[PDB]
Amino acid sequence: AVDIALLHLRDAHEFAPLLASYAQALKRPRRPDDFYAEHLLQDRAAEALGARVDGNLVGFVIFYDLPEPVTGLRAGQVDHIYVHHDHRGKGIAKALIDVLADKAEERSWSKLVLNAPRVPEDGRKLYEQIAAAADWSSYVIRF
Amino acid sequence: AVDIALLHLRDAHEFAPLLASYAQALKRGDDFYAEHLLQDRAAEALGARVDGNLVGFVIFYDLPEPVTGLRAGQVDHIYVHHDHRGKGIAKALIDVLADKAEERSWSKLVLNAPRVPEDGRKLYEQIAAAADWSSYVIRFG
């Protein structure tokens, strides 16, 4: 039932409302919904995996394939995961991370870093069950 | 007289031993890896020169911010040669990076400090606010 595949620029319009719902948690929009979907899908540094149920796009995960200077290999980095609220309790978010983790060999990843925002809690609630706590510390300067 | 400028491929030869010394402490267990790093589409490296010699660097990513449609900078690695500590060079590198924020319309600069070596943390905790997100890792191998 759950079909997971990489999103491309073709999918911006379908991706747009799903991304808009996720952003409504993280607050802020002088652009329409399609602008944010098209903007991300035209950045070659970002990739997004999508989850479809019965033809409808009902989840996504945005990830970066980044250089890893310490080992000289690469690493994946996830900052954003979201499942449509009518499709909770189905294990979809974990299915998205599982597919991403399975790309490790293809991409020469030594690791997958998962960053969970404070709100919404869904990324955090998933990651703490399926991954190890990070041992580095993080800081931010706002502009 | 610290001279701070973005590193390019020509700088790879000087950058490599500085990256190797930093990487030594970070973890362990390629002669041209610095060229791969300096030609990545997401990563960039700022270098610090004193009397012509490259003595420090910071590696950063200019990443999309899907929520806002902007960009944001992310620092995971900073290093200053051990004979050039106590001169404010690490802070100066972050200061130049903050200047690029307006040029690049960054809403924020994320600073990630590994557990070892502690120099990044000791700098970041004095110049920035603690992060309010949480992080996790799945390792392969």
For chain B, the DSSP string reads -EEEEE--GGGHHHHHHHHHHHHHHH----TTHHHHHHT-SSEEEEEEEETTEEEEEEEEEEEEETTTTEEEEEEEEEEE-GGGTTSSHHHHHHHHHHHHHHHHTEEEEEEEE-SSSTHHHHHHHHHSEEP-SEEEEEE--
Angle separating helix axes A92-101 and A122-130, nearest 10 degrees:
50
Q: What angle do CA A49, A66, B20 make, to 5 degrees?
A: 160
CB-based contacts of B56: which residues, under 8 Å, 6+ apart? B18, B47, B48, B78, B79, B80, B81, B84, B89, B90, B93
According to DSSP H, which parts of A42-121 are helical? 92-101, 104-107
**B78 occurs within a structural domain:** yes
Q: State yes or no: cis peptide before B117, omega within 30 of 0.
A: yes
**B137 occurs within a structural domain:** no
**A33 occurs within a structural domain:** yes
CA dist list (Å): A83 to B77, B81, B133, B134: 32, 46, 19, 19
Whole-number Å distance between alpha carbons of A73 and B140: 11
Could you tell me the two tokens for B18?
């500085």
For B57-74, the DSSP string reads EEEEEEEEETTTTEEEEE
CB atoms B137 and A139 under 8 Å? no
Classify A86 as helix, strand or coil.
helix
Closest CA to B116 of B53, B31, B23, B44: B23
Q: Tokens 């070892």 belong to which residue? A: B116
Classify A13 as helix, strand or coil.
helix
Q: A96 at the B interface (CB within 8 A)? A: no
Whole-number Å distance between alpha carbons of A55 and A49: 15
**B139 occurs within a structural domain:** no
Sheet holding B134-139, edge to edge: A2-6, A46-53, A56-68, A73-83, A109-116, B134-139, A132-133
Per-residue burial over B57-91, b if 16 or more Cβ lie within 10 Å, else e, is bbbbbbbbbbbbbebbbbbbbbbbbeeeeeeebbe
Classify A54 as helix, strand or coil.
coil
CA dist list (Å): B136 to A43, B36, B46: 25, 26, 27
Whole-number Å distance between alpha carbons of A127 and A125: 6
Q: What is the CATH number of the domain that holds A120?
A: 3.40.630.30
Resolution of the coordinates in A? 2.3
CB atoms B140 and A71 under 8 Å? no
Closest CA to A49 of A36, A66, A62: A62
Distance from CA of B138 to the nearest CA of A (A): 5
CB atoms A138 and B113 under 8 Å? yes
CA torsion sign, A76 to B113 to B137 to A116? negative
Q: How many domains does chain A have?
A: 1
**A140 occurs within a structural domain:** no
What is the tally of helices (H) and strands (E) in chain A? 5, 7
Would you put residue A79 in left (φ > 0), alpha (ψ -120 to 50) or beta?
A: alpha
CB atoms A139 and B110 under 8 Å? yes
Distance from CA of A51 to the nearest CA of B (A): 18
**A138 occurs within a structural domain:** no
**A137 occurs within a structural domain:** no
**B119 occurs within a structural domain:** yes
DSSP code, position A43: -
Q: Which residues pair with B120 in a beta bridge?
A: none
Residues of chain A found within 8 Å of residue B19, distances taken between Cβ atoms: 69
Whole-number Å distance between alpha carbons of B101 and B103: 5
CB A108 within 8 A of CB A74: yes
According to DSSP H, which parts of chain A are helical? 12-26, 33-41, 92-101, 104-107, 122-130
CB atoms A31 and B113 under 8 Å? no
CB atoms B102 and A143 under 8 Å? yes
Q: State the best of A21, A33, A34, A137 to mutate against chain B, taking most chain B CBs within 10 Å.
A: A137
Q: State the best of A130, A139, A142, A143 to mutate against chain B, taking most chain B CBs within 10 Å.
A: A139
CB atoms A135 and B115 under 8 Å? yes
CB atoms A19 and B137 under 8 Å? no
Q: Residue B14 belongs to what domain range? A: 2-127
Of B40, B111, B137, the CB nearest to A140: B111
CB-based contacts of B87: which residues, under 8 Å, 6+ apart? B2
CA torsion sign, A110 to B64 to A93 to A136? positive
Q: A15 at the B interface (CB within 8 A)? A: no
The alpha carbon of residue A21 and the mean position of all alpha carbons in its chain are separated, in whole angstroms, by 14
Experimental method: X-ray
CB atoms B138 and A80 under 8 Å? no
Classify A41 as helix, strand or coil.
helix
Q: A140 at the B interface (CB within 8 A)? A: yes
